[PDB]
Amino acid sequence: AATSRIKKFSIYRWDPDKPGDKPRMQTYEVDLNKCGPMVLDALIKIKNELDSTLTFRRSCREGICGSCAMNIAGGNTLACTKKIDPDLSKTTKIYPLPHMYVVKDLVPDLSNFYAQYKSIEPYLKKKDESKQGKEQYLQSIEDRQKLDGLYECILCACCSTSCPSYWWNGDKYLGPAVLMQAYRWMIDSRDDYTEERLAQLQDPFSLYRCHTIMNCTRTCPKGLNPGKAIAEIKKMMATYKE
Amino acid sequence: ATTAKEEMARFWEKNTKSSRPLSPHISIYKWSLPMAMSITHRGTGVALSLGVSLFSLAALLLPEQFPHYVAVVKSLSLSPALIYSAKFALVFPLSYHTWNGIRHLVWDMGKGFKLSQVEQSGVVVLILTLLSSAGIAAI
Amino acid sequence: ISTQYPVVDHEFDAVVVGAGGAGLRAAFGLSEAGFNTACVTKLFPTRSHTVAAQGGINAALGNMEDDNWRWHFYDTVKGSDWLGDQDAIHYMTEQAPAAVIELENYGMPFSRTEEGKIYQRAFGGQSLQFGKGGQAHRCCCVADRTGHSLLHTLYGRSLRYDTSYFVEYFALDLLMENGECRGVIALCIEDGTIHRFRAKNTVIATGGYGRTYFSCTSAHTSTGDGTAMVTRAGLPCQDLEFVQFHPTGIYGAGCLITEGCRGEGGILINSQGERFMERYAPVAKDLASRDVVSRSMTIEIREGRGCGPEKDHVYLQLHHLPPQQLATRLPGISETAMIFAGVDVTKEPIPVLPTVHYNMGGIPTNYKGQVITHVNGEDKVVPGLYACGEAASASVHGANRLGANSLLDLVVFGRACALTIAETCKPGEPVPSIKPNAGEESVANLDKLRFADGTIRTSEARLNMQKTMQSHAAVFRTGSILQEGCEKLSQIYRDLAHLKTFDRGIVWNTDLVETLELQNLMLCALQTIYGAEARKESRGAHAREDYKLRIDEFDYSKPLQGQQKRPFEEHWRKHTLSYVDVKSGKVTLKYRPVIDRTLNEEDCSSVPPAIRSY
Amino acid sequence: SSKAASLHWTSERAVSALLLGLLPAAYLYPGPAVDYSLAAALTLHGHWGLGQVITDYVHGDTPIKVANTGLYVLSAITFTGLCYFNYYDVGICKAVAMLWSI
Ligand SMILES: *Cc1cc2c(cc1C)nc1c(=O)[nH]c(=O)nc-1n2C[C@H](O)[C@H](O)[C@H](O)COP(=O)(O)OP(=O)(O)OC[C@H]1O[C@@H](n2cnc3c(N)ncnc32)[C@H](O)[C@@H]1O
Ligand SMILES: CCCCCCO[C@@H]1O[C@H](CO)[C@@H](O)[C@H](O)[C@H]1O
């Protein structure tokens, strides 16, 4: 109502349709008294009420779809679940996921990331696939438990775009996102290609560019630990037999 | 459809010839102790290696043998302070890199991955680094 | 008219539009069956609203107790308040077990029972022995993240086939010729190009349109885009006034709090500590149908027993349940409760309120997934057009959907669509031609909005629509209020000529995309509130306080023995078919009979209307 | 060998663990045996390590080829010079001790 609390946001901007445009930071003032508690709430309010040209991804609005991942106050997170910092003395800086080709504004081109995911064959593979569809495969509570902390990934790419290794060798290093998923299939008690899944990582980059920086785990919006999955892979990588 | 390898290839092809800018990273990313201790582990390893390489080079190139250089220095009867300061500075890198290297070996065993334990192991590393250096620079 | 926009033409055997759970299943189902398939979606597949589904997907597997798909069939038919086509419901429920087993064999990380099988929980309105043997436990699930897993499993599976995806392409309209669908036209958001995908068959699985409302559980992306393209094709949409308000969307944010909470032992409580459902549905209590639970909660609030400082919501209590159970069965909502309500479900209740959630109505199809038109009293399938998922109206949900029946719906009919095109067509068959300027009107409209410089900005119009639908078409409805809404609404729709956009580019112009979604949304809201106003009866989710009874062809509360069957035109047990004159925004209605026969009376008996209470 | 990448990763760790043990061994049993072990261990560890660095930060077929080439020289030279010191001079342990006498 009456008695505002104006917060400033410096957001990255780049129009691929303004010939010869240069990335620039634009600042927006928002009244937190007439805005939802989340940064996405702020981003939407801005596009709706001050600059409908501010472009970005969003959909779910509850942190499950992974669409809105961006860099807020130097860290990768989901705009839709990151509380706006109430300290009016600070201007929150919003950038696109780091080291990514910017398609427009806060929208990164994630196709390489998607292709990397495709490359590890994230889907159940059984030697005999002659019986697909006749009966539920059996999996114990204990084996289904090993999947917790792995299946929840929403493929948001915050962790991978936070890892310096992926910043320097993203073309060959799969990244925490995809690697954890590769591990997600390695330990599914129902999959029969564990050895082949490891074989695919027998090169200097795919997996071994991880030097345990742990930015990934710190940045994960779902509280997942890709960094640890990666280390379990290394232990398998170095114990499996042909 | 397009295979993953095909997609990666057009991704680079498309973008490297585009007018699309690269979003910033190292210049805008928020640091943490873990991150900082991690690259420091790199800088120290490298420095230890360049140090070990300068030593072997000198063993093959300098006219005089080690004992003479040691003497030369003892003949300057330098302030212990400076003596201690140099020794400390000498062993810090090694100490930091050693303790933190043990940290990495523990991680390689797959232990200490909870983010809060990463912060713990690191701080322990930092104090052990500080203590071992002081101890040694004093020996 | 000038091609200021370049055009790229594609030719496939099939074009699937939408890549949520239904679209994905339809798309590789087609590729799997040999068809050179294109899948066009505005979102990267895993971003689809489906990924947010929580509680589960029903199937009489019998992993918890002995089951019978026929019992599931009955629960659904009863659930739909008899507005559901029983042939479809028959198909859907008999196929369930196989469809779910198929998801598991794809790798869906279902939760497990002690016997290594798919763990199933209880859900609203499911019973054993056709309503006589107590609570059913057939909601197969992945903790409270079944949608997320289902969508990831399907996307991963699709990676194995030659399906061509066109991600972040916004489908504008259908390419209609002589009442047959030739394909679709779209805007490629990444590069500002126009694309025409000619195919012999088009499947529309574009999701619902909960964003016609101010407060929904739906994603900002649920804007009924495909529903809208049907309208613009001159085809009718069905039962749009049948909007489901989920009992427990969290207070404030709107995020859904799965019914799975109640399935696991959660209870609704008023500002007086009362478990009021023991009073509105003495038997099912908190597990009554959604329309029922939502109305019940609503009365409690307007009657003054609502909780919180504004007494505008009630409490979902879970804290009486063991903590390991909450962690194992409801990990998702536990976190969501904390994030959006600061609630620790192990100590305090979650503030909830009925929230627009799902659309029972949609593009009308037959049980094979084929879109149907209704001329002179007969259902005719529109050649080359199919629909599945929430975007459709098979209708297996009729006037009210049983929770966990959509995720089922999605995979069953998405596969049906595939199986059907397959038995009907052959891969490679010569793709139908399209006139050189086909779609030219979509570009027109597109370019018109891109430069709009009126007085009313999109966000302003939209909000006008959402607020109108919110107070004129809620849980309880009335003719005067609905009549008001219909006009306000038609005003807003006329006022779209006063629209102002600002972004003038074409690449990733979401200013423009969201304006197209407003046109799309309005087409849906109109049909929804007008159909509501015309439907003078109370059925399932549609509750008219001025017409509190359900009106069938017979009064089924008494013996039919010597009853003058009411004429079609004098009772409401029929599907609403809406049409809209795009230009004016004039809504036109017609009705078609509800299909009561099953696919085999010997195998599954048609179930006659009856009193519907829980 | 198909398992080259993992064999290396292991060897790398094995060598660090090796080099770690020589630290206490050089202070408790200083002499030739340890001095050479340190020469070998320090050279190898520093080599593999500098290679990870090049691998991470050097791109292009040629630049890489180059960096790697010159690393291989730096390392053989280093191992050589360390071995010279051990043979013609006091050796690593005794030297440290003397340095730690100033
Ligand atoms: C909102 C909601 C719904 C829901 C639920 C939880 C939430 C928070 N939980 C459920 C549950 O546990 N069990 C169940 O059976 N249902 C549940 N629901 C309802 C159900 O999820 C939905 O009915 C179902 O997900 C529908 O999905 P469908 O496959 O029909 O599609 P979608 O997910 O909505 O995705 C739409 C796809 O279409 C594409 N699209 C849309 N517009 C366009 C345009 N214009 N151009 C091209 N493509 C378009 C989208 O990109 C998407 O892929
Ligand atoms: C090169 C920049 C030096 C910054 C070193 C420490 O940085 C601090 O580390 C803490 C512990 O992880 C974080 O919680 C904190 O946010 C971060 O600023």
Ligand code: SF4
């Ligand atoms: S691991 Fe965490 S952050 Fe990385 S993608 Fe999955 S969820 Fe997003």
Ligand code: F3S
């Ligand atoms: S930050 Fe990168 S280096 Fe490895 S542990 Fe995480 S992937």
Ligand code: FES
């Ligand atoms: S909008 Fe879905 S994760 Fe943020």
